[PDB]
Write a protein that binds this DNA or RNA. Structure first.
Ligand SMILES: [Mn+2]
Length: 395
DNA sequence: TTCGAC
DNA sequence: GTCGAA
């Protein structure tokens, strides 16, 4: 595996230094198209040296690493570190014409982050930072990582997985639900390309456990309608679902409704009437240690598999993969199992939250990031959640 | 809320 | 919590 970046260039995975060097040389896979060529930096430390250094590093690295040229950074200063004062400056910024907001908070402050973050996600791409955490020693690493996620939030594509276009799924739908407490949950469905790029994402409102199966179906239907409306010629002959999340235990009823949903989409010509599909459950399992391997595919039964990833003692991060439903022929079966497992391994190398791979499939990881926000926006009574469907606002 | 491992 | 990363 390699990552594809700008200008047809590919760099090795598992190597941050070469990835950044690569970006500087060849640019990211896609430079975001900006409307204003302007970003706001909002903070409360007008004379702070660390803020000056932060701003200077953001300017240089946006230009040199990201090949986003001639961008202007405008500063906005809030006086009091509370919601209404910070909001007024967010408003002055939005009124001036900016592509994104980089907002420095005084410290870790959970209710204030969720109230503001929730308000920004509904308005404009944004990247938060904590004033109290900045340091001279960490600032380069800090800014390089932050820009991965901020460029992505602006609609850029830092890098994609180089995969063989003849193998794997036409689309992968990561779906399931996440309980936010003992009673309430939200369903999610996110469509990905085999190269790890998110094409479209839908999340349900917060609902009770009793409404889970109905909203699971409607959420998946909505995400495909939206993918297909925006990608009318994107045929899907090979479809995989990756089901995850802490959700109600209702396996057979859930599998039944997911096959119905695939059948309905077939009827509506959203996917091929001869689509080959599998429904998979993906579950993180307990780590183990090899006492003194990687991307290894383990068969437990005809339908249960593990994929092991690197995590004296070698720590291993295991992922359980169960094929709960498929319409594969028994002759293609073995071939298809290799293909879905290799695809899960490729997707586990895609993470636009930072340079370092999470070694967890993006189809599982990005829904976890959404969960964190939807759950805490609810708990701290923030603002409930089209640029949203196609952009990774949750990074 | 840099992220993510210890 | 605390710290190290190309
Ligand atoms: Mn983030």
């Amino acid at each position: 595996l390699t990552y594809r970046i700008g200008n047809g260039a590919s760099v090795p995975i598992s190597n941050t230094g070469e990835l950044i060097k690569g970006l500087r040389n060849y640019g990211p896979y896609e430079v975001p198209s900006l409307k204003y060529n302007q970003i706001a930096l909002i903070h409360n430390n007008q004379f702070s040296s660390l803020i000056n250094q932060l701003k200077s590093q953001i300017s240089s690295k946006i230009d040199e690493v990201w090949h986003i040229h001639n961008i202007n950074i405008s500063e906005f200063i809030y006086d009091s570190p509370h919601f209404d004062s910070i909001k007024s400056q967010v408003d002055n910024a939005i009124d001036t014409g900016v592509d994104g907001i980089m907002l420095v908070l005084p410290e870790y402050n959970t209710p204030l982050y969720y109230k503001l973050k929730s308000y920004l996600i509904n308005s404009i791409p944004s990247q938060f930072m904590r004033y109290d955490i900045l340091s001279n020693r960490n600032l380069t690493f800090y800014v390089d990582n932050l820009l991965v996620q901020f460029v992505s939030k602006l609609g850029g594509k830092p890098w994609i997985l180089n995969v063989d276009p003849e193998k794997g799924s036409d689309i992968i739908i990561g779906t399931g639900a996440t309980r936010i407490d003992n009673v309430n949950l939200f369903c999610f469905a996110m469509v990905f390309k085999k190269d790890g790029t998110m094409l479209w994402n839908e999340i349900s409102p917060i609902v009770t456990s009793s409404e889970y199966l109905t909203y699971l179906k409607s959420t998946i239907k909505k995400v495909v309608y939206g993918f297909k409306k925006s990608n009318p010629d994107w045929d899907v002959e090979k479809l995989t679902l990756h089901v995850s999340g802490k959700r109600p235990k209702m396996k057979d009823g859930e599998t039944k409704i997911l096959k119905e949903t695939v059948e309905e989409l077939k009827k509506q010509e959203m996917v091929s009437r001869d689509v080959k599909y599998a429904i998979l459950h993906l579950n993180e399992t307990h780590p183990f240690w090899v006492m003194g391997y990687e991307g290894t595919k383990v068969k437990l039964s005809s339908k249960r598999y593990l994929l092991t990833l690197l995590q004296m003692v070698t720590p291993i991060k295991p992922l359980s993969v169960e094929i709960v439903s498929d319409n594969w022929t028994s002759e293609e079966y073995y071939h298809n199992v290799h293909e879905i497992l290799d695809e899960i391994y490729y997707l586990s190398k895609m993470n636009w939250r930072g340079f370092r791979s999470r070694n967890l499939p993006v189809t599982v990881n990005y829904p976890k990031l959404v969960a964190g926000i939807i759950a805490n926006v609810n708990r701290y009574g923030g603002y409930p959640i089209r640029s949203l469907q196609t952009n990774p606002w949750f990074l």
